[PDB]
Amino acid sequence: ASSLAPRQVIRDGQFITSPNGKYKLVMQADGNLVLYEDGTKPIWNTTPVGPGAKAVMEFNLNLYNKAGQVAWSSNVYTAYLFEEFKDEAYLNLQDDGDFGIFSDEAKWGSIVLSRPEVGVKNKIIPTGTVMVPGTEYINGNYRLAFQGDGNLVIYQINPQVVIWATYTMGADRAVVQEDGNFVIYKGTTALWHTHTATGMPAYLKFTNTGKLFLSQPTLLWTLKRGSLSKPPKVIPGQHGPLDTTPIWSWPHDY
Ligand SMILES: OC[C@H]1O[C@@H](O)[C@@H](O)[C@@H](O)[C@@H]1O
Ligand SMILES: OC[C@H]1O[C@@H](O)[C@@H](O)[C@@H](O)[C@@H]1O
Ligand SMILES: OC[C@H]1O[C@@H](O)[C@@H](O)[C@@H](O)[C@@H]1O
Ligand SMILES: OC[C@H]1O[C@@H](O)[C@@H](O)[C@@H](O)[C@@H]1O
Ligand SMILES: OC[C@H]1O[C@@H](O)[C@@H](O)[C@@H](O)[C@@H]1O
Numbered sequence: 001a002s003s004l005a006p007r008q009v010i011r012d013g014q015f016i017t018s019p020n021g022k023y024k025l026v027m028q029a030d031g032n033l034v035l036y037e038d039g040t041k042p043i044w045n046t047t048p049v050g051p052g053a054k055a056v057m058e059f060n061l062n063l064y065n066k067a068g069q070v071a072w073s074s075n076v077y078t079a080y081l082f083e084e085f086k087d088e089a090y091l092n093l094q095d096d097g098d099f100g101i102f103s104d105e106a107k108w109g110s111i112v113l114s115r116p117e118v119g120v121k122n123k124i125i126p127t128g129t130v131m132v133p134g135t136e137y138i139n140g141n142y143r144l145a146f147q148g149d150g151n152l153v154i155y156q157i158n159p160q161v162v163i164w165a166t167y168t169m170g171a172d173r174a175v176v177q178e179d180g181n182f183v184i185y186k187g188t189t190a191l192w193h194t195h196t197a198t199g200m201p202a203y204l205k206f207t208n209t210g211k212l213f214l215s216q217p218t219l220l221w222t223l224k225r226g227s228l229s230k231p232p233k234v235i236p237g238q239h240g241p242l243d244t245t246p247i248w249s250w251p252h253d254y
Pocket of ligand 1: 107108109110111112194
């Protein structure tokens, strides 16, 4: 795990580790949140608040002492801290040892929403994913399938019901692009797309409620760079089954 999901809590020796293995962020039993290099050299810390402490990803990364007070915080500079942001924001620790907080807004959906769904669980489909006939994803009682015929379809599994579909007949592939657009293709012809080309890479969220959203990463803060007012271009990191969030990396200088 190189990341923290929204609301995720770490404590009592729990940690995350950069993709390359070199950096480790650990919430120690003594209540000190520490960044280690090569498992032996502490390069940054909050300093300890004592036992019974925890750190939690809730828009900010916040460190709580046993008395429930906030002893350290990322202190991300936003103007409006909507309590629905706390279920959306996640954290990556990257290969140069910097760590950063993302809160991404949806840019496209298979359906327009009245209001967020509560306790929805998302299957991340990351940047550079190339779907191909026979590709499918299962999340709960819903199936997302790129089919032989080229249709991208969401099915309710039980009972079988079509919930949504692109009707892109003949398409050969579907691509979650680095430019921020999700596009379905016959050869080089775009049959369908999400109109989300922004130069910021895309990922998809397929829900256990039978819906599909495209978001793009919005880096808000890093330990080394403090709060950011504009979001810098990031690059997709290595996404596998162990990771519950998108994975990103961001450059050293500008
Ligand atoms: O983002 C909301 C909607 O916008 C429309 O133009 C279409 O592209 C739909 O596919 C989408 O559900
Ligand atoms: O990403 C490939 C696979 O990942 C697993 O979680 C599930 O979503 C599968 O349905 C999917 O085929
Ligand atoms: O309406 C959705 C249906 O569309 C049809 O054209 C086919 O692609 C089916 O596989 C799919 O279930
Ligand atoms: O061709 C562009 C496509 O973009 C989609 O998001 C919708 O607007 C489709 O109805 C359309 O076919
Ligand atoms: O309209 C379809 C096209 O939109 C473009 O701006 C890019 O994202 C292309 O990759 C995509 O094929």
